[PDB]
Amino acid sequence: GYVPAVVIGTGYGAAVSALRLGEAGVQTLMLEMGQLWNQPGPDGNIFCGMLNPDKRSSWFKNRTEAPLGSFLWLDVVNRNIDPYAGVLDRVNYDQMSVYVGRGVGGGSLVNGGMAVEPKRSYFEEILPRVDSSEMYDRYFPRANSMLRVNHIDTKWFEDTEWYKFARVSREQAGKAGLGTVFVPNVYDFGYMQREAAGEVPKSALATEVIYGNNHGKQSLDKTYLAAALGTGKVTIQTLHQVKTIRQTKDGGYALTVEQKDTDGKLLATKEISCRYLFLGAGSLGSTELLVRARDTGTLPNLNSEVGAGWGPNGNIMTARANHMWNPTGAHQSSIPALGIDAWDNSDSSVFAEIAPMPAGLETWVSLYLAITKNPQRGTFVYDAATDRAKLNWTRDQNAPAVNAAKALFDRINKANGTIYRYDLFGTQLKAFADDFCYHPLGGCVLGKATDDYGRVAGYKNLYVTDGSLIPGSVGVNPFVTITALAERNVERIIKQDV
Ligand SMILES: Cc1cc2nc3c(=O)[nH]c(=O)nc-3n(C[C@H](O)[C@H](O)[C@H](O)COP(=O)(O)OP(=O)(O)OC[C@H]3O[C@@H](n4cnc5c(N)ncnc54)[C@H](O)[C@@H]3O)c2cc1C
Incomplete structure (x- = not known):
């Protein structure tokens, strides 16, 4: 079970990375815990709308929920549902609920599609170690076009x-x-x-967005991922969740990956090894994988910055x-x-x-x-008892x-x-x-838990590519920044490391 490069997740950071890797001739395998959203449901549509939510609207919940702000009018359409591999996941922490997408394309499947560049002066303030000229002259325009x-x-x-x-x-x-x-x-x-x-x-x-759009929205599966698959060097395995990451006895990486069905039943657990490992499991997913690896001893050389610097983008x-x-x-x-x-x-x-x-x-x-x-800022702390990263964030924060x-x-x-x-x-x-968050940022901050290009501190050929890199705030809707930063990071990584 060896593949030259493995990308965990299929969100913005992951999609950009897989495309460039494929174009560079690197055989790449993307592992996505959610589904490939292309099968018409009971209503003939792939996704359910906001006025007719069903099991497709939620990631393993027993009842649908009204979009935040519309409970007074949309609770009437809520119904009990079978826990299913739905598209929107409300992750409940102690005093914060983070909403994230689950499926091929990640958050691009459920987001409002707002593509906004951060104010240059603010970008320079939050990421002083990054060359802002390259970002605005090359990477932002590149992201705008591809997206x-x-x-x-x-x-x-x-x-x-x-x-x-x-x-x-x-x-x-x-x-x-x-x-x-x-x-x-x-x-x-x-x-x-x-x-x-x-x-x-x-x-x-037709009141569709948060549980996916059956038309019009150019989510990642239509843009970056479609292009990545077009290189002939990229493959995507769905309903595959990476649980652990370790460094093989020779410098490469091995992963324990669980394959489940849409009902959440465990079908198999397999071992997948690689030379280059890219994490694109999101602010929550990538941080959890690393804090787990550090604390359980599979990646003992990870630093104390792993898990820190999280913010809900205000x-x-x-x-x-x-x-x-x-x-x-x-x-x-x-x-x-x-x-x-x-x-x-x-x-x-x-x-x-x-x-x-x-x-x-x-x-x-x-x-x-x-x-x-x-x-x-909050910190993700690993709980060995439940094998879960817990977000230490209080409402007063x-x-x-x-x-x-x-x-x-x-x-x-x-x-x-x-x-x-x-x-x-x-x-x-x-x-x-x-106490909600649509824009989780931080956990594996660029320059803190990693170098200035996302190379995880303490390891070689190990990279983080997503929202976990951002220092908790960008001042605007985050996915264009995540995409542009990913373009900058993977290009440098391929040039110097691959
Ligand atoms: C309702 C809502 C509205 C939003 N609106 C906007 C908007 O209009 N504009 C904007 O800029 N941003 C918006 N955002 C935020 C934006 O979607 C996120 O910032 C962006 O998707 C983050 O990209 P990412 O690559 O970090 O990770 P994500 O897109 O979250 O993707 C991570 C992927 O990894 C998968 N994964 C996680 N862990 C594992 C693992 N262990 N194994 C395998 N796969 C794994 C996940 O299932 C997911 O598909 C919104 C988000 C939500 C929830």
Whole structure:
């Protein structure tokens, strides 16, 4: 069971790495714990929508859940389900719930497709050891092109009922002296226009996104992974989860990999060895594999930085109740297109996505996913008893994030005479959701747990390629940064190590 290169996971870091490895002539095997999402379900579609969730919506849960912010309207469609290898996984830690994708393409399957480059001045602040010129002159443009990032037509956006929710918030923010910015996306906007005209099957305009899009969204399986398979040097094995990693007696790596069926039944456990090992299991997955390896003694030379520096990208969700004369619309595209930019690198910085709501009826609610600058970091500690990495993060650690998000929206509320909603996240009268995360960043920080290109400290031919490399914050939606950084890392690695 030997393969020259093995890539764990099939998310952004993994996809970029596998493509370049394949192009360099290196036979590569990608191991993905989730499924290859290409089989039509009971409704004839691959993915379930947000108004008709079923077992495909969740990674081994016994009941469906409403998208955060829409419980009041979507709980009615929740149903009990059989634990299944679904597409969206809500990982519950002590005081933090991290949402991640499971399947070929990782988070690209369930994300909002928002492709945004971080502010250069901020990138230079968070990663001082990295050459920012190479990043902005070469790697970011490369990522933009490969990801198939596109831009919404302004005339269509301005006239369509599907983005009224966005225009309402723009107007409200404008009164507080705040401006908005268009957010590039991997969802084909031309296709979206055709959806509204009833010319093609709807996806974004049919309340679909978080459990996958049956059309329009150019997830990784269609971009990087498709190209990787096209090299003829890359293979992908699904429902294969790597459990342990060790260094063979000669410098290479051996992995224990469990193969399961969609019901989670263990079919077999196999040994896979390789020369080059790339981890792309995400901020949670890669960090867990390494903290486990260190603490169980299979990779004893890993440093103390492994597991540290985790941050939720300052993720905070909040909502405002609009005046009766400012309805947000019953028809809201599932793909965000506008955001409020109030990020200047200071502590009050906030970059907020104007989030659509799937209710399907007028609620007058404006939803926002704020990205803030909070210095608090958590640490993944290995629990040998349960063989699980535990995230040491407490809810109060998000206080700075809530404070920044509140200060911004308070300005908008003041300028418009509106108030927050306090009932969207539960019965505790909370206006700010502070214990969830869509953008997990850190755990195997670049330059700390690894060198400046992701080479894991203490080992040769061992690499980390994903969100675990980011120092807990990027100030914008993270996948373009993860992709660009991965392009930079693998190119150097192939040149010097391979
Ligand atoms: C609901 C939601 C909305 C978001 N919206 C946006 C957005 O619009 N724009 C944006 O920029 N970002 C967004 N994100 C975040 C973005 O999706 C993630 O930052 C990105 O996917 C992280 O890439 P990654 O390569 O680190 O890992 P991931 O994409 O998470 O992928 C890791 C992969 O490894 C697999 N895996 C894990 N452990 C193992 C193992 N042991 N063995 C085998 N396989 C393994 C996982 O199943 C998964 O497929 C969103 C995420 C969510 C949850």
